[PDB]
Amino acid sequence: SQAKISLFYTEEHEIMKFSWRGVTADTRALRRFGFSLAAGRSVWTLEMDAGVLTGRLIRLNDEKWTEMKDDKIVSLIEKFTSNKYWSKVNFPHGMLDLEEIAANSKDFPNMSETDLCFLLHWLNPKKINLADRMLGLSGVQE
Amino acid sequence: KISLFYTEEHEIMKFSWRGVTADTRALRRFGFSLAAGRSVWTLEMDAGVLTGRLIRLNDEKWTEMKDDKIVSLIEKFTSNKYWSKVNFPHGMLDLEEIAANSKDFPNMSETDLCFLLHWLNPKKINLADRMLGLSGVQ
Amino acid sequence: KISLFYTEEHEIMKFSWRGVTADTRALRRFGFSLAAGRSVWTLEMDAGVLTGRLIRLNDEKWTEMKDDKIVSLIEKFTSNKYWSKVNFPHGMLDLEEIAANSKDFPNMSETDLCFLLHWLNPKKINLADRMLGLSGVQ
Amino acid sequence: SQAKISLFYTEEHEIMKFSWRGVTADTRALRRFGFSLAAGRSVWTLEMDAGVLTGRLIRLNDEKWTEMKDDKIVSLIEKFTSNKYWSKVNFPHGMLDLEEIAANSKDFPNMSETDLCFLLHWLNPKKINLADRMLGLSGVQE
Amino acid sequence: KISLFYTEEHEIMKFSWRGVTADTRALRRFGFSLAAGRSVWTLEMDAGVLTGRLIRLNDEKWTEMKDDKIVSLIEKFTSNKYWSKVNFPHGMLDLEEIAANSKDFPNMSETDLCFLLHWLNPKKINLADRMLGLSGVQ
Amino acid sequence: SQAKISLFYTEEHEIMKFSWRGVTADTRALRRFGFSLAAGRSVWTLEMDAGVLTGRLIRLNDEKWTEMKDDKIVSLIEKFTSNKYWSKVNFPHGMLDLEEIAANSKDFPNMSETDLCFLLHWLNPKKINLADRMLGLSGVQE
Amino acid sequence: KISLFYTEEHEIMKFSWRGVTADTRALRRFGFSLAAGRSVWTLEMDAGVLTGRLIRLNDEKWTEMKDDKIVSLIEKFTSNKYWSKVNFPHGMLDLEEIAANSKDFPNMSETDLCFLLHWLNPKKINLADRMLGLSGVQ
Amino acid sequence: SQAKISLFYTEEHEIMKFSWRGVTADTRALRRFGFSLAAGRSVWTLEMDAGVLTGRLIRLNDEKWTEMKDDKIVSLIEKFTSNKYWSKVNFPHGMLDLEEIAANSKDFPNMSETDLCFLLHWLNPKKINLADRMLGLSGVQE
Amino acid sequence: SQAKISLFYTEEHEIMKFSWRGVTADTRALRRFGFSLAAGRSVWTLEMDAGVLTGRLIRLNDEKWTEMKDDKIVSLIEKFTSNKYWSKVNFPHGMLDLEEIAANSKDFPNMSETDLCFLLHWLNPKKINLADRMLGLSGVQE
Amino acid sequence: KISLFYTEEHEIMKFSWRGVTADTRALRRFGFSLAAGRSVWTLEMDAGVLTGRLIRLNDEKWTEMKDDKIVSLIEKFTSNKYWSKVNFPHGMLDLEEIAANSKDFPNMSETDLCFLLHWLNPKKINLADRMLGLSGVQ
C-alpha cells in the first residue's frame, strides 16, 4: 500500500520560566507546522528568514517535532505532493495574502482553490498567545 | 434560562525587550446571564478593587460552567426589583457582615446571600499549579 | 520541646507545551519549632539569596528530622533576647566571619555558632542522584 | 478455595528524562488502578477517553501493570464483582461527584455507601505531582 | 507617484518623578504624498478632535505602507480642484453621512469616498497587544 | 546584629499631564518622608489632616514609598526610636516652629537639640516647585 | 576670569483652581560674568521680545556651563569700549545681517560675531522631551 | 584557532508595567553594551558612576547580558584588546566628546581615528525612547 | 443597598494667564454645580442660556467636573430625585427670586420650603471674585 | 485684648472688554485692634504712598494673625498719650532713621520701635508664587 503522510508541530521561543520573579515568557513564542512523506524521512515546513515567510518550503530536522492527527490535512498534502516540483514552490515573499496566493496559483491543478487555501492556512506559522499559555491553554490561533 | 460563567485575567504584565513577566497568581472572575444571548453580569472592579456594584462585561471571553445551587440563588437574587442597582460596601472586605446587614434581598436567607457573594467574589489562580495540570483556583 | 525540620523546593521550573524542565539541582531548606504546634523558623530568602534574617514559613511542607547536637545549639541560640530580630550580612557568603564577628550570642562559642549557621544554610540537592536512590544533599 | 483478586497500577506520561537540559517531565503524568479476578486473567480499569472518565469499566492488557497489596480493597472488589453485570456498569460521564455516585447507586446492594465510595476513590486515576516525583516521591494523591 | 504612510502617537503622557504612564490605547494616523519628496497630507486634529480639514504634517516620522485600492481612491480624490480646501463637518462623527451628502468629489462614488474616509480616519492602538507582538490597530 | 532602618519618600498630587493643552500640574504637589524600623514592617510618617501637620506620627502603608539613602538620618532615627513612647509623640498642632519644638522637647533625652531639629526638618513635608519639576528637577525644598 | 551661564523660564503659566498649565516649550536664556562674583550679563527681553540691548540680570538662578570657544569670543567682544551700550535692531530677527552690518566690534570677524549672537540668543525647551530624560534645547 | 569575541547588551530601568493605570515606565531606561574575550569569561563594559561615564572599562557580570552579532565591532574589539593595558584605559571623565577622545588618543596605535571613534560610539550607553518602546520598537539611538 | 449620589463643580472662564503683562483673567469667571444619581451616569445641572438661568435642569457631560463632599446636599438631592418628573422641572425664567420659587413650588411635596430653598441656593451658579482668586482664594460666594 | 490683622489689595486693575489684568505683585497691609470689636488701626496710605499717619480702616476684610512679640510692642506703643496723633515723615522711606530720631515713644527702645515699624509697613505679594501655593509676601 502507499506510504503514510505524518503531520507535526514545533514551537520556538515558547519556554516560560518560573522563578521568584514570577513567570517570564518571550513575546516571539510561535508554533510552526510540518509534514513527512514517509516514516523516518525529513520534515517539510514553510521557510522563514528574519521572522518573515520567504515563500519557499524547506526540510527542518534540527528541530523537535511532535506528531499530530488531521485526516483532512493528510488528504490535502497527498494531493499537493503528487505534483512534480512541489518542493520547488516559491510563493510571494512574506505570504501576506493567502486567499490571493491560492486563487492565482496554477502549480497545483489537482487541488481546488478552497483546498489549497485551507492547506496554506494550516502550514502558516501561528503566534502563541502568552496570556492564554500562562493559563495553560495552547494559545494557538492565526 | 439562567447561565453561569467564568473569565480569567492577568491584572499585571511587566514588559522587557522581547519578553513579558506575569505574577505567579492571576485572577478568575464570575458572572451570570439571565437569558441565552443576553449580557453577562459580574461584580465591578475599578483600580483593582471591588466597587460593590454589578455590571455587564461582554468584551471579555466567558466560559460556561454548571452549578445547580448557584442558579437557584441567582433566581432568588434577580427576582428582586433593583438588584442591578445594588451598591455593596466599597472593597467588599467583610462578605459575612455584608450578607448579615443586607435588607435588599428579603427572599434570600443570610447563609444563602453569603454563599452567593462568596461565588461572585474574584478568586486568585496559581499559574505554576495551573501549568502543572491543576487549577490554581485558591 | 524543640523540633528540627527540612523542606525541599525547585527554585526554577521551565514550561513547555504539556512539559516541564527542572535544574539537575533543587534546594533543601532547614527550620526549627520552639514548641509543638508553633511556627517553623527558617533563614529568609528573597530574590533567591539569603537576606540575613530569620522568618516563620508555615505555608511549606516540613518533615521532622533528628539531631541532638543542633537541638542543644538552638536551645543556646533562642535563650538570647531578640534572636528573631537577627540581621546577618546580606547574602551570608562568609559563614566563618559572620560567627567570628557576631556579638549577639554571648552564650554561644564561635565554633558552635558557625556549626549552627552551617546547618541553617540552604543546601543544593542533585535530582539525578536523588532519583537513583541516594540523597543528592551536597 | 475461591480465586484471589490481584491489585495493580500503571503509570502514563510519567517518564522523566535526564539530559544536559536538566530534568524534563510531561505534565500529563498520571497513575491508573486496576484489578484481576484470577491469576492470568485480564486487568480491569475505569475507561478514559480524551483524558476524561467515561463511567465504564474496561480490560486494558496492552499496558505494563505492577502488583500492589491492599487487603481492604480486595474485600471491596470481592463484594463489587459478586454482582451480576458489574462489568456493564455505566457511571455518570466524567465521574465528577464520587460521593453522589455512591449515594445514588442501586446496582451494588451488597455494598454500603461508604464502601462503594472508598472503592470508587481507589479506582479513580490520580495525577502525579512532578515537583515531588523529581524529589523521588510517588507524587500520587487525588 | 502617490505614496501611503502612517504615524503613531501617545495623545496623553502622565509624568511622575523619574516615571511616565501612558494610556493602554495610543493613536495611529494616516497620510499620503502626491509625489516623492513632497509633503505628507493628513486629516487635521485640534484639541484631540478631527477638525474636518486636511493639512501637511512633515514634523512627524511617517512610515510607507502599500494599499493599491487606496492609491486608486487618492488618485480620484486629488484630481478634483480644491481637494486640499475640503472642510468636512467638525468632529467627523458620521463618516457614512459625510460621504452620502458630499457633492465635492463627483468622480468618486459614495461607497468609495466612504472607504477612503474610513482609511484616513485615525485609529486607536492597544499597546498591551502591541507589546505582546501584535498590532493593537483596532 | 540589630535591624536596619529604611528611609522612604512618597509624593502626592505630583502628576503632570501632557496633552494638546500643554503640561498640567496640581499646585498641591507635595513630598512626604517616612521610615521603617525593620524590613517588611510599616512605614511611619508625620500625620497630616486637612493639609496641616497634626503633630502626631502614623503608619501610612496604603501609599507607594520609594527607598532613599541617608546615613545621618538613619543614625538620628536609631536614637529617636530607642525612646519608649516615640510613636505616642504629640508635637504642637501645625508644627510651625521646628526650632522651638526641638529646644523645648524633653521626650528625647538621648538626642541633642541640633539633632532633633535636623530630623524634624527631614520629616517635614516639602512642597514640589512645579516650575522646576516641569524642567525635570525634583523641585523639592522646604 | 570669564564664566558662562544659563537660566530657564516659563514665559506663560495658566492658572486654574488648584492647577497650573504651562506651554510644551519653555525658554533657556544665556549669560556671562566678566569676573567671579560680578553680575551676569544677558540679552534683554521686554514684552517677550529681544530689545537688542544687553543687561545685568542677577535676580535669576544661573547655572555655570563650559564652552572654550564662547569664552574666546566674549574676551574679544568685551575688549571693545561701550560693548554694554550695544543696541542691536529691535527683535533681533536677522542674526546673520546684524553681524554682517555691525561696525562696533572690529576685533571680531563676521562669522565669529554671528557665532556669539547665536549662542546669546534665547532657545526654546521642549518640556515633554525634557521630562523623558533629554534636554528639549532645540 | 584564536578565541572568539562575543558581543552583548543589557538594559536597566527598562520595565514597563501594565496595570489598570495604563503603562508605566521609568525615564532612566537605558541600554549598555559589552564584550567577552572568550566563552565563559567576564563581560567588559564602560563604567558608569552616578549615571555618568567615568572613562574606565570594568567587568559587570551581576547583570543579564544578551548576545548580539556585529562582525565590524568584533574586528574593532580584536584590534582594541591586542594592545597591552587596554583594561587600564582612563578616558576623560564624562566622555562627552567622543570624536576628540579618538583624535587625541595615543593608546591604540593599531587602530585608526575613524575606527576607535566607531567603537567608542558602539560602547556608549544609549537611552531608550519610551514613546517608541511602548509602540514595541527598541527605542535605542544615541 | 441604594445607589450613591455624587456632588460636583465645574468652572467656566476661570483661567488666569501669567505673562509679562501681569495676570489676566476674564470677568465672566463662574462656578457651576451638578450631581450624578449613580456612578458613571450623567451629571445634572441647572441649564443656562445667554448667561441666564432658563429654569430647567440638563445633563452636561462635555465639561470637566470635580467631586466634592456635602452630606446635607446628598440628603436633599435624595428627596428631590425621589419625585417623578424632577428632570422635567421648569422653574421661572431667570430664577431671580429663589425664596419665592421654593415657597410657591408644589412639585416636591417630600421637601420642606427651607430645604428646597437650601438646595436651590447650592445649585445656583456662583461668580468667581477675581481679586480673591488672584490672591489664591476660591473667590466663590453668591 | 490686643489683636493683630492683615488685609490684601490690588493697587492697580486694568480693564479690557470682558477681561482684567493685575500686577504680578499685590499689597499686604497690617493692622491692630486694642480691644475685641473695636476699630482696626493701620498706617494711612494716600496716592499709593505712606502719609506717616495712623488711621482706622474698618471697610476692609481683616484676618487675625498671631505674633506674641508684636503684641508686646503694640502694648508699649499704645500706652503713650497721643500715639494715634503720630505723624511720621511723609513716605516713611527711612524706617531706621525714623526710629532713631523719634522722641514720642520713650518707653520703647530704638531697635523695638524699628521692629514694629517694619511690621506695620505694607509688604508686596508675588501673585505667581501665591497661586503656586506659596505666600509671595516678600
Q: What is the DSSP string of D66-113?
A: EEE--HHHHHHHHHHTTSTTSTT-BPPTT---HHHHHHH--S-TTS-H
Interface of D with B (CB under 8 A): 27-28, 127, 129-131
Question: Amino acid identity of E3?
Answer: S
Contacts of E27 (CB under 8 A, 6+ apart): E8, E9, E10, E11, E122, E123, E124, E125
| Mode of pairing for the β-strands spanning F6-12 and F30-36 | antiparallel
Name the nearest CA neighbour of F119 among F140, F106, F102.
Answer: F102
CA distance H5 to H71: 10
C20:B128 CB<8 A? no
What distance in Å separates residue G79's CA from the closest CA in chain F? 35
Chains E and H in direct contact, meaning 3 or more beta-carbon pairs closer than 8 angstroms: yes
Sign, Cα dihedral of H30, H36, H39, H40 = negative
The single residue listed with the C-alpha cell 498706617 is: J43
Contacts of H14 in chain B (CB under 8 A): 16-17
Contacts of I38 in chain B (CB under 8 A): 85
Nearest CA in chain G to E13: G128
User: Directed axis angle between helix G110-120 and helix G68-77, to 10°?
Assistant: 110
Chains near E with 3+ CB pairs less than 8 A apart are A, B, F, G, H
Count CB-CB contacts under 10 A for residue A135. 21
Cβ(H40)–Cβ(H16) below 8 Å: no
Nearest CA in chain E to G128: E13
Contacts of E21 in chain H (CB under 8 A): 21-25
**Coil, helix or strand for D28?**
coil
Contacts of H129 in chain G (CB under 8 A): 132
Contacts of J132 in chain F (CB under 8 A): 27, 129-131
Nearest CA in chain J to F27: J132
Contacts of C48 in chain A (CB under 8 A): 19-20
Chains F and E in direct contact, meaning 3 or more beta-carbon pairs closer than 8 angstroms: yes
Chains A and C in direct contact, meaning 3 or more beta-carbon pairs closer than 8 angstroms: yes
- C76-84 long-range Cβ contacts below 8 angstroms, 24+ apart: C76/C105, C76/C107, C76/C108, C76/C112, C77/C105, C77/C108, C77/C113, C77/C116, C78/C2, C78/C34, C79/C107, C80/C104, C80/C105, C80/C106, C80/C107, C83/C54, C84/C41, C84/C54
Cβ(J53)–Cβ(J60) below 8 Å: no
Sign, Cα dihedral of I7, I12, I14, I20 = positive
Q: How many residues does chain H have?
A: 142
What distance in Å separates residue B24's CA from the closest CA in chain I? 33
**Coil, helix or strand for A80?**
helix
CA distance J47 to J28: 16
Buried b (16+ CB within 10 A) or exposed e, C62-81: beeeeeeebeebbebbeeee
- The conformation of residue I128, written as its DSSP 8-state character, comes to B
Q: Which residues pair with C7 in a beta bridge?
A: C29
Q: Which residues pair with G41 in a beta bridge?
A: G32, G56
Q: How many residues does chain F have?
A: 142
- The conformation of residue J108, written as its DSSP 8-state character, comes to S
J127:I26 CB<8 A? no
What distance in Å separates residue C35's CA from the closest CA in chain F? 25
Using CB atoms within 10 A of its CB, is residue A74 exposed (0-12), middle (13-18) or buried (19+)?
Answer: middle
User: Nearest 5°: CA angle at J57, between J51 and J59?
Assistant: 135
Contacts of J120 (CB under 8 A, 6+ apart): J30, J42, J43
B131:D27 CB<8 A? yes
Nearest CA in chain F to J133: F27
Count CB-CB contacts under 10 A for residue D78. 14
Nearest to A134 among B19, B22, B133 (CB): B22
> Residue D75, Cα to own-chain centre: how many angstroms?
16
CA distance H88 to A49: 42
CA distance E40 to E33: 5
Chains A and B in direct contact, meaning 3 or more beta-carbon pairs closer than 8 angstroms: yes
What distance in Å separates residue H1's CA from the closest CA in chain E? 41
Contacts of A14 in chain C (CB under 8 A): 16-17
What distance in Å separates residue E73's CA from the closest CA in chain B? 34
Name the nearest CA neighbour of F94 among F139, F129, F117, F125.
Answer: F125
Q: How many residues does chain A have?
A: 142
**In degrees rounded to 5, what are phi and psi of residue I69?**
-110, 135
The single residue listed with the C-alpha cell 497690617 is: J30
CA distance B125 to B105: 31
Q: Which residues pair with B4 in a beta bridge?
A: B32, B65
Nearest CA in chain J to F142: J134
Q: How far is CA B6 from CA B27, B62, B66, in A?
A: 10, 5, 11
Nearest to C11 among A11, A19, A133 (CB): A19
What distance in Å separates residue G138's CA from the closest CA in chain E? 13
Q: Which cell numbers in the block locate residue G133?
A: 530624560
Q: Which cell numbers in the block locate residue A64?
A: 523537535
Q: Which H or E element spans position A6? A: strand A6-12
What distance in Å separates residue H135's CA from the closest CA in chain G? 16
The single residue listed with the C-alpha cell 484470577 is: D38
What distance in Å separates residue J131's CA from the closest CA in chain F? 8
Nearest CA in chain A to B7: A135
HSE, side-chain direction, 13 A CA sphere, residue H95: 23
User: Nearest 5°: CA angle at D9, between D8 and D13?
Assistant: 160
What distance in Å separates residue F95's CA from the closest CA in chain E? 27
**Coil, helix or strand for H58?**
strand
Alpha-helical runs (H) found in A1-142: 71-80, 98-104, 113-123, 130-133
C18:D28 CB<8 A? yes
B14:H16 CB<8 A? yes
Q: How far is CA F131 from CA C113, F15, F140, G122, in A?
A: 57, 13, 11, 18
B20:E128 CB<8 A? no
Q: Which cell numbers in the block locate residue I62?
A: 462635555
Chains F and B in direct contact, meaning 3 or more beta-carbon pairs closer than 8 angstroms: no
Size of interface A-E (CB pairs under 8 A): 9
CA distance C46 to C122: 13
CA distance H7 to H20: 38
Contacts of G16 in chain I (CB under 8 A): 11, 14-15
CA distance D78 to D70: 13
